[PDB]
């Protein structure tokens, strides 16, 4: 059966899930013929643009601006075909390279159209990324394009140096920045071939420096199906993500998700910090029905006096990116009789467990699996558990391979080591339940996650060498409540550097500097010797021992805590 | 300990070579004053013109012509101020580039003498070399001054019609070409200091197009010792070395190692193909005493009938640039009571390690490292290996930085890949004996070397894909007894060319218009498309291990083999 049909199938299953029909979708997904395959074309244009022209497809708001827009399926499908235009124009040819890098904003969902259309590669870019970060992405993979938003030109254009590439913004400015927007014609289609890639993420890994997982034509624009599946999202709903740019949930909840369905998007777009109240005032206001929130978000919400808020036509509310405890679970529900559905997945793949939508929620479980991917949880030396309680890392089997699992990394040694024989690793771990529910313990790696940001140990360790006064370093996750981890940071001294709160300020202020603020460490501990294995290895794992023994007797020896 | 004083030590410890005489020759260079130093002034002219200016400093020999030469020191330091004055006296200040590209001759030698004396940067050109690929070294670092002899006056034209710059000839032609030979006067030594620049090599990377090494007026003429030691060289000694102008080996056993210890060089030039018997009998008719030849020489020298020889005042005898087969070493000591003693180097060192005189060789093994050097085996995560037979990266620890270190690469990356983290990488592996023997296994790079020649594949890649037939190309070693690998290209066709050995034949041509001889590709094999990681690099290990399975299997699939 047809692509259309499929997805016309999918979204009347959305407007009443249940695990038969589910099943039924299941086998339909074994069915589809992807081989050669573009999801705007085929999908957004064939579909919605054709059934939905006129419907209001995103709705946008800047909190702190007040500038409001509202775009239809059609005005959007214009926009987009514009750009490509206007790519090709300036000379892009599939595969090429589209760095990406705004504020939430209509012209940011028209440029993912653009490229899924034009088969283009896109590196979509947050804006907290500092010059010293661009530089090296640029490093990794040189841009034939670069976009951004007119706040965040001044960093694009410094880490470029001396490289000549393509230029462009969503606003006015003083050279070399020409607006996507010129010619709506020769916008036709790149024939794209499924297998194809359209994006690379530039993700974080425990042992080296960030690298890129990389996603096709179909992983992420048919496997995010997973990801609809467990949230809700039907047609007739208005969904909203608060997710940041340069990031997967973005691609997921606030692209692919609501578009599959033919959904209306609210994307609300603020600078600086979470203006929590305003926020869910402008999700009251807006009238959202479909709502995803990573846990650091619910965390804060929680503390407001919610008497304030009627949430009068909001039917779907969700989770993912971290843990999310029963207690903020439970508040929720009390305050509004809404249940906050957790759900798991990573950068690499689409959703992969959670609390569907005909699911009775365990709290804190993340859920089931989704049957379309084969989820294994593996002992040492890959022995897949029965045992519920007993705990283990989390892995896909390859044997048929789950669509929505990127391709691959782009360091191939990342490679040999997370893909073993049959099985990917995603490295975290968790147990059963009886009922085969699922309920994360932790990471295997020595992988931080703050904030919903997962942040890699070497990313922060080379960043703090640059200081002269720095002869090792070790970064290590501390628990934090409010996100979920902390950085801290271990460093021994060259000789004539003396440890002192003065020292661990100037170093921590170089690091603003180059770091992302969410990677900047709030605790910087002088130390002698940083434990390791005879290898030479650095035994993190052994710091983290440490820090649960002080934290249990409450000890700081020469630590400076920001 | 004067520089004067250091030179004569260490030629009466060639006299007799002890390691003990040798701990003690390496702490006397800790102590040597070299921060201002010409090797010329104050070692050729005032040791060896001074005490041998009479002696034959060099004989040379023209095979084919039949063209016989001897020079004294006198004479050749003479002849050296000849040209240094002519060169100053065409507009020539310390720190300009000359490209020298000569056939074996006497004149070679003295314009060694006037560079480095003259404080000059020299680029050392092979005689092989194409117009295209001077064009790329011009383009690289642009010539003050082109040197160059009779025949391949006309190649040097082609590439400098671009310029003018002074020109220079070996012999006497019409045009722009001056001789050396004008003045004895205006010889005066250049004040250069230790780390002044005197010469540019040319080195092939792996990744990409050849970058330069860069070497100074102490690193090769006093680094040269490490070189010396372990080719025993003694001052009453006829030098021989078998390497072609503009390389390492050159400057290093034919031009520094003799002059060091005052011996008498010898030189012998022959156009096209080695007739290796012709050759052996000049080695016998003159009398050397000291022979150096790369390994791929040797394997020509052992299909002959050895009882035609009988080596009368052949004393030393050693190889460098390749492994030397266990059997060609049995079969020259059975033959002649003579071991060839393997040493090992690169152009961006001198000698690292070696079967020192007093060292028992063991077969294969390249023996013992330097001490100048701190030569260590790091395995993956440079941890310094203590496992004998453990396979590890060979690299140099920079602590106390060795002498005879090329100052660096002319391109900053490649400076950071190779200089890691207190090591430079060779990239070579090895592993230990028991006693601290070292045995080669081969490159981490995908680096080619044939015949002593260090071939690097995107020079050959990019010179395929020049031809209108080729759509893709990956170029790889396969294994040949003779030169140590031989140079395989696999090529993927545009459409409407039709694989044939005819049409292998059209490329190979093309590419000797190109291509320097020892990159033409012995070996063409048409196919469909090249194995590939998703980044889209190209598994070049994965080509060898095709290669190795179908040469276990004895099989072949449309590869034309010339
Ligand atoms: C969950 C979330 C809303 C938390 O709310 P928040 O407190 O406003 O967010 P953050 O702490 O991450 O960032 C805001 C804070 O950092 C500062 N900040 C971060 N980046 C900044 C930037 N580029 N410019 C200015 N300030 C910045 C803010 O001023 C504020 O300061 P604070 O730390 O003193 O509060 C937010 O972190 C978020 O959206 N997370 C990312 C989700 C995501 O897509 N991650 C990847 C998953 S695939
Ligand atoms: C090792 C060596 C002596 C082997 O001798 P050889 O087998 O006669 O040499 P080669 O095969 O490399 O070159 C001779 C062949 O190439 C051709 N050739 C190579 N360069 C040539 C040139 N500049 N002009 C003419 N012919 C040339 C010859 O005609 C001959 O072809 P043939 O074998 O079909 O008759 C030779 O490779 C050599 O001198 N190598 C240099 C070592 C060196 O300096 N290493 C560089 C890095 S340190
Ligand atoms: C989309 C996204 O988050 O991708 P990314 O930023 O790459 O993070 C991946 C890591 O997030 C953690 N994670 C995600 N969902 C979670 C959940 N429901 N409960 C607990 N942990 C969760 C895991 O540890 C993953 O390995
Ligand atoms: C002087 C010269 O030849 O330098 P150069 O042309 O730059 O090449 C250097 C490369 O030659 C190889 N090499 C040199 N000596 C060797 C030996 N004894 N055994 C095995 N391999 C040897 C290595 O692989 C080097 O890395």
Known sequence: VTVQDFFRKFIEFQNSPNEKSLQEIVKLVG???????????????????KERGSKTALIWRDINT????????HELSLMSNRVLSTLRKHGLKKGDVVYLMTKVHPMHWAVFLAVIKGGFVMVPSATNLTVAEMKYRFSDLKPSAIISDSLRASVMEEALGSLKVEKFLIDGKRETWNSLEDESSNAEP??????????????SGTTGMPKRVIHTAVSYPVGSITTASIVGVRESDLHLNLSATGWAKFAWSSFFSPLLVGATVVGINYEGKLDTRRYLGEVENLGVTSFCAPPTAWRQFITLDLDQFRFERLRSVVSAGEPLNPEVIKIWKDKFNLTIRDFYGQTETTAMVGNFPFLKVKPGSMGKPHPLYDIRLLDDEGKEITKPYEVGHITVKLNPRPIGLFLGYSDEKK????????????????????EGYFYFVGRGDDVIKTSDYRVGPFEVESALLEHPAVAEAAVVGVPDTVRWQLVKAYIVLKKGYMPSKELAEEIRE?????????????????????????????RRVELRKREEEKRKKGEVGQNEYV
Chains 1, 2 share one sequence.
């Open 190 to 203: 790149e024939d794209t071939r499924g297998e194809d890639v359209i994006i690379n993420y530039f993700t």
């Open 510 to 538: 170089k690091m603003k500097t180059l770091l992302s603020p969410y990677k900047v460490p709030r605790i910087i501990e002088f130390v002698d010797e940083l434990p390791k294995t005879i290898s030479g290895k650095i």
């Open 31 to 49: 069915q589809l013929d992807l081989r050669r395959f573009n999801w705007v074309r085929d999908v957004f244009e064939d579909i919605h643009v």
């Open 415 to 434: 490679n040999m080591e997370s893909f073993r024989e049959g099985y990917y690793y995603t490295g975290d771990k968790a147990y059963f339940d009886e």
């Open 66 to 73: 007040g500038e409001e827009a509202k775009l239809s399926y």
